[PDB]
Curated annotation (Swiss-Prot):
Organism from which the protein derives: Homo sapiens (Human)
InterPro entries with a match to the protein in the record: Atg8-like, Ubiquitin-like_domsf
Location in or out of the cell: Cytoplasmic vesicle, Autophagosome membrane; Endomembrane system; Mitochondrion membrane; Cytoplasm, Cytoskeleton
Gene: MAP1LC3B
Biological role: Ubiquitin-like modifier involved in formation of autophagosomal vacuoles (autophagosomes). Plays a role in mitophagy which contributes to regulate mitochondrial quantity and quality by eliminating the mitochondria to a basal level to fulfill cellular energy requirements and preventing excess ROS production.
PTM field: The precursor molecule is cleaved by ATG4 (ATG4A, ATG4B, ATG4C or ATG4D) to expose the glycine at the C-terminus and form the cytosolic form, LC3-I. The processed form is then activated by APG7L/ATG7, transferred to ATG3 and conjugated to phosphatidylethanolamine (PE) phospholipid to form the membrane-bound form, LC3-II. During non-canonical autophagy, the processed form is conjugated to phosphatidylserine (PS) phospholipid. ATG4 proteins also mediate the delipidation of PE-conjugated forms.
Protein name: Microtubule-associated protein 1 light chain 3 beta
Tissue expression as described in the entry: Most abundant in heart, brain, skeletal muscle and testis. Little expression observed in liver.
Outcome, altering residue 31 to A: Decreases C18 ceramide binding
Annotated signal sequence range: none
Disulphide connectivity of cysteines: none
Annotated membrane topology: Lipid-anchor
Length: 115
């Protein structure tokens, strides 16, 4: 069901390598709904090419807009399995430090703080 369960390690690496070749200024991000989430909708896709100059605060806003959330819906985002240290961090730096060995940057969202 999850991205890693649907694609082999080889397939994931080769896709990241393709993204470096054809979309060099983008960060390859996998964004998935927490498996127990009951309030927030699922996204229309899983793999996102994020401009590498945005910060985490902006990425949160982007994802909230893609989910068409209103102001009273809570949204929490994990990166590489843990909470964000700061929303101010540039995504190019987050990628360097938090990328998976397959080359994707993995994120999970939920409406509660306890995924
Ligand atoms: Cl590009």
């Amino acid at each position: 069901k999850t991205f890693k369960q649907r694609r082999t390690f080889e397939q994931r690496v080769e896709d990241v390598r393709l993204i470096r070749e054809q979309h060099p200024t983008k960060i390859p991000v996998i964004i998935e709904r927490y498996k127990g989430e009951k309030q927030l909708p699922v996204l229309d896709k899983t793999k996102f090419l994020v401009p590498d100059h945005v910060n985490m605060s902006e990425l949160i806003k982007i994802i909230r807009r893609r989910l068409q959330l209103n102001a009273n819906q809570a949204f929490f985002l994990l990166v590489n399995g843990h909470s964000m240290v700061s929303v101010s961090t540039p995504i190019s730096e987050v990628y360097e430090s938090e990328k998976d060995e397959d080359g994707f940057l993995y994120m999970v969202y939920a409406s509660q703080e306890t995924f």
